[PDB]
């Protein structure tokens, strides 16, 4: 049972910089080997760098040379990637893989971290208003009501949205974004509830969008004014 | 009435180190140990009746791969012991102790603890006429290799000889090998490869090895002998308790004829069967 | 060079055999390329699946099978399930490069076909006291892909104002999208008409959902 898991995501403006981590768990190392590897919003995929134990031979993604080093932490089990002097070219998700294998697998890339967001910016960030999207007043089959928050006008992905610190995991879903016209996203997240508890149980969004430092809670509730 | 039930279906989980010495491969494979992985050469000279590969195994000395592979891991795994014996070849003028930092022992450079990588002394590459003759009691496997290079460059640069040859004889044995020169992707690092063959000898038998280059050394043998040893991959723990046989799923007892946890067996134990149930009234 | 190809997407059956392909421009495929094949299911769910030419990783079903047949590589998948349905990469070694193809969709039928769940939502007043009213139309998990989305505000359709996208939810593997309009609150006063109509080929009918 091997996972990678990813850390960092965040706006950077041309020339400038950013550092990522991918925390490595359920395998004796930090990995065997281990390599970074983006995926462009065309969805394209190239290799960036690579590590032995201990960096032993090429690892270097030509068009990358010089701008990115790429580090791991055999104490702490860590892989890091910081990559400074950005370029436009290098806004991607990139992915913290461990190369597959022994002799008899030797299958390059087979586990993968669920990848982290670099986005080389210009101009400015802007960050999120939360609205809450309230429930209804007429009961249409009785059962249950449905309510969520709106994350609108953020830049740039991702927001990460929970409902009551995890204490609601399902019948929840977050939908994608929109890129609207004016170059920012657009977000909800629903969640469909029974009609009894709506008044004995609060609901709060725990939307964040962390490539800028933004954490806000907003809770939904009907506004009793028709 | 009462019932008789006579599929063992349910083990301890824990692997019981008596009556069978059980020995741990921790961190590598029976290769590894038999090879002579720097992290595993703690296993040198052991003797079991049963070893046990874990799914976390691995290697860190240079990067190879073996033709026939489970058929030499379980050939040493059958006469449970890595017993070898070093025999002082002579390798005259081609450098031997070669090693490099995917291999770091201690310090530094290390390579495999019972091969000898050879190279080039001053910048020359003679062709090997050595012999080795097994006149005692027992039967030698011969466990050596062969550099598969990354380019042309690096065939020349530690065997200058443009092609190499290895070609390890007996007087009932030949296997000629040659390397082909390929850059592999990064395993450990390097591009470079080494595949590993066997020669077993039986008494009176001698052991050549011809080559002009490519030749990864042997540096002795493993005395062989014939015995009730085997090999298991298996993830249960070991504890110091009774049951005189194992499964991958720890120790059965052995109470009942058959059982249900395992095709896989070690010792006296019940047949595998798929039954799920049996009782049998009393 | 080093640019490495294969087809843009596939489409296929369960149970039948499928082969995806990929493709060298510096010349003939070889085992010296050690084809690479990983396996992304959606939100970035990445599964590196054949690797060094016809290995198969240990987790992968035997069904799974890489070749070369001709100058090409070639990842086979015989006895194809509705658990294939996803996007396949692929990997060759250039000795100084390391270097993907621009990955092959596949699309899988059988897939059952999923109606939407169609919920609309009205600006929030905090919302409307500021300069922007914003109103949601969310359809939920339908398995065809294809979808249309209609707005119209007393009984007549708009747009210039309205902005959607595509869903492509690993959820249960269904599709489930939203719509957003924005109005401004002096705009959005043709009062107590507005809503969201959609229109699936899972429509026996087009749902609509008014406030
Ligand atoms: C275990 O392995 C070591 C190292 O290969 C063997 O050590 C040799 O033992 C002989 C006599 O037993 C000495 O003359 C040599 O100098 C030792 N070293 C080497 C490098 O050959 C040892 O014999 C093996 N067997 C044991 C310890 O039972
Ligand atoms: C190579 O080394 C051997 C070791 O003594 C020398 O002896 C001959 O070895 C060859 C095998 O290559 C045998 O066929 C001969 O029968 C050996 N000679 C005798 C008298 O038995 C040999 O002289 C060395 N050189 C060569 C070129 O073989």
Redesign the interface.
């Known amino acids: 049972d091997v996972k990678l898991v990813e850390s960092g995501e965040g706006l950077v403006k041309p020339g400038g910089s950013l550092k990522l981590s991918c925390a490595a768990s359920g395998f004796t190392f930090s990995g065997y080997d281990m390599s970074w590897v983006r995926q462009t919003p065309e969805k394209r995929l190239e290799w960036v760098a690579y590590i032995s134990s201990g960096g032993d031979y090429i690892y270097y993604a030509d068009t990358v040379k010089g701008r990115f080093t790429i580090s791991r932490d055999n104490a702490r089990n860590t892989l890091y990637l910081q990559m400074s002097s950005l370029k436009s070219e290098d806004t991607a998700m990139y992915y913290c893989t461990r190369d597959s294998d022994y002799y008899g697998s030797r299958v390059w890339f087979a586990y993968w971290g669920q990848g982290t967001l670099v986005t080389v910016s210009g101009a400015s960030t802007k960050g999120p208003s939360v609205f809450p999207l309230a429930p209804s007043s007429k009961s249409t089959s009785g059962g249950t009501a449905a309510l969520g928050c709106l994350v609108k006008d953020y830049f740039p992905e991702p927001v990460t949205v929970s409902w009551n610190s995890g204490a609601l995991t399902s019948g929840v879903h977050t939908f994608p974004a929109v890129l609207q016209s004016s170059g920012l996203y657009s977000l909800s997240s629903v969640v469909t509830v029974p009609s009894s508890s709506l008044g004995t149980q609060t609901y709060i969004c725990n939307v964040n969008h962390k490539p800028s430092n933004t954490k806000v809670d907003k809770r939904v509730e009907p506004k009793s004014c028709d | 009435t009462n019932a008789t039930e006579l599929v063992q279906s349910s083990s301890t989980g824990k692997i019981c180190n008596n009556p069978h010495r059980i020995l741990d491969g921790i961190?590598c494979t029976l290769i590894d140990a038999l090879l002579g992985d720097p992290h595993c050469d703690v296993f040198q000279n052991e003797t079991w009746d049963l070893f046990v590969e874990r799914s976390?195994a691995?290697?860190?000395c240079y990067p190879?791969?073996?033709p026939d592979?489970a058929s030499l891991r379980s050939l040493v795994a059958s006469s449970g012991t890595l017993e070898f014996i070093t025999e002082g070849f002579t390798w005259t003028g081609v450098t031997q102790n070669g090693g490099s930092?995917?291999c770091?022992r201690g310090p530094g450079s290390g390579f495999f603890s019972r091969l000898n990588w050879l190279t080039k002394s001053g910048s020359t590459y003679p062709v090997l006429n050595v012999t080795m003759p097994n006149n005692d009691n027992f039967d030698k496997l011969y466990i050596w290799g062969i550099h598969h290079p990354?380019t042309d460059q690096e065939q020349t640069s530690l065997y200058v000889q443009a092609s190499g040859r290895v070609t390890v004889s007996t007087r009932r044995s030949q296997q000629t090998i040659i390397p082909n020169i390929?850059?592999?992707?990064?395993?450990?690092?390097?591009?470079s490869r080494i595949s590993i063959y066997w020669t077993i000898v039986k008494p009176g038998d001698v052991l050549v090895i011809n080559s002009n280059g490519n030749l990864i050394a042997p540096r002795g043998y493993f005395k062989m002998r014939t015995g009730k040893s085997s090999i298991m991959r298996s993830d249960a723990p070991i504890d110091t308790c009774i049951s005189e046989c194992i499964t991958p799923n720890g120790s059965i007892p052995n109470d009942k004829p058959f059982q249900n946890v395992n095709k896989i067996t070690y010792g006296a134990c019940p047949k595998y069967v798929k039954q799920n149930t049996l009782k049998l009234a009393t | 060079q080093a640019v490495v190809t294969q087809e843009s997407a596939l489409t296929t059956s369960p149970g039948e055999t499928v082969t995806l392909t990929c493709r060298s421009s510096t010349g003939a495929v070889t085992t010296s390329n050690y084809a690479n094949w990983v396996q992304e299911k959606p939100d970035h769910l990445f599964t590196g699946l054949i690797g060094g030419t016809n290995n198969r990783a240990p987790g992968v079903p035997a069904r799974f099978s890489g070749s070369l047949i001709g100058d090409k590589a070639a990842l086979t998948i015989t006895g194809a399930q509705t658990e294939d349905e996803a996007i396949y990469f692929c990997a060759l070694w250039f000795s100084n490069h390391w270097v993907f193809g621009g990955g092959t969709k596949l699309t899988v039928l059988g897939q059952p076909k999923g109606a939407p769940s169609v919920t609309l939502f009205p600006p929030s007043s905090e919302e409307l006291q500021a300069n922007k009213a914003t109103l949601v139309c969310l359809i939920s998990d339908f398995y065809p892909g294809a979808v249309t989305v209609a707005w119209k505000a007393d009984s007549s359709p708009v747009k210039a104002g309205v902005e959607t996208t595509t869903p492509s939810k690993q959820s249960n593997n269904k599709y489930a999208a939203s719509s957003y309009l924005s109005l401004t609150p002096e705009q959005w006063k043709s009062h107590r008409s507005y809503s969201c109509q959609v229109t699936h080929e899972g429509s026996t009918v087009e749902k609509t959902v008014a406030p």
């Open positions: 961190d976390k691995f290697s860190n190879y791969d073996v592979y930092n995917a770091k990354s390929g850059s592999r992707p990064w395993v450990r690092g390097l591009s």
